[PDB]
């Protein structure tokens, strides 16, 4: 497998580096996250974890 | 006689194209179009029944 990055950091994609419901808390996240980062094969799962976040209102 | 529509009821029948490009069983199944009238009026037969409840 392969993984995502953000600034000084490298980390697995499928949960945010910021606290969950991260787009609702800090909506300008993409303006740090996605300058050249769109090339990552993990970006699809970073996106799913960021927006369809399974936020604290949901359950599994 | 007009009241013969007591004895008989509508039906579903197969239809070639219900709009989205697929065949269905349909309540508006269209049976024959007859166009004998030279003024260009059409008489259409359909699996509904209309003018009665």
């Amino acid at each position: 497998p392969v993984m995502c990055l953000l600034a000084n950091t490298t980390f697995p994609c499928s949960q945010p580096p910021c606290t969950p419901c991260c787009y609702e808390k800090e909506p300008e996240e993409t303006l740090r996250m996605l300058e050249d980062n769109v090339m990552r094969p993990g970006y699809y799962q970073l996106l799913q974890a960021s927006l369809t976040c399974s936020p604290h209102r949901q359950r599994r | 006689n007009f009241n013969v529509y007591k004895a008989i009821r509508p039906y579903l029948a197969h239809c070639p194209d219900c709009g989205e490009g697929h065949s269905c069983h349909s309540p508006v199944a269209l049976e024959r179009i007859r166009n004998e009238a030279t003024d260009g009026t059409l008489k259409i037969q359909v699996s509904l029944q209309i003018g009665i409840k």
Partner: antibody
Amino acid sequence: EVQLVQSGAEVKKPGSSVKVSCKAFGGTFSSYAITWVRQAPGQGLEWMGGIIPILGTTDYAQKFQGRVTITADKSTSTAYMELSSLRSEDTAVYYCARDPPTHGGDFNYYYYGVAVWGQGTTVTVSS
Amino acid sequence: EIVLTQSPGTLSLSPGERATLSCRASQSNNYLAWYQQKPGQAPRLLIYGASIRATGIPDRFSGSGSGTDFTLTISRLAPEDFAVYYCQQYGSSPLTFGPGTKVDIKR
């Protein structure tokens, strides 16, 4: 996964209204087309001949209303269902807590990327 | 149109290994999905067919289709997998649920 809830079980008599309720939460502040499926005691899943997806019109399948009359509602996260003037055979478990049921052949279409199910609830139409 | 039909009308297996449930109709186009009912209890989602997968839970149960036919498999079915299984495609003049294929854990 979307979190799902219903009103508790009931006991009822024929010829009256039943005001069942469902709530769906985390996303879905407008219902993701959740639908009032129903199963008669111990049978295979012969389903609700009434309500299909709803949140703008009370759309049913091609069967009920003809024997017994049914409708549903579209409030924020909150999907009421009314079944009325019912009879003993309308005793069933009702599973509102269900996926989008995409209506192939007449209007518009729905997603895959998240699962959604949940519990059922019982109305006991009884003597 | 059609009415969905499931190929096993009964099945029975010990704890462990594998199952392969199956369902058919002369068309597909808009997703059917496979649902498991434990006795006395509400269904839950296992699979989507027609072209692409979805699930609620980790990949012990999984499935696929070809042409007219659609399938559901369970891996290491030792747990509470005594259940009846259904699928549906919802739309227009009737299409409806499958009949309910039942499989059990061989006491």
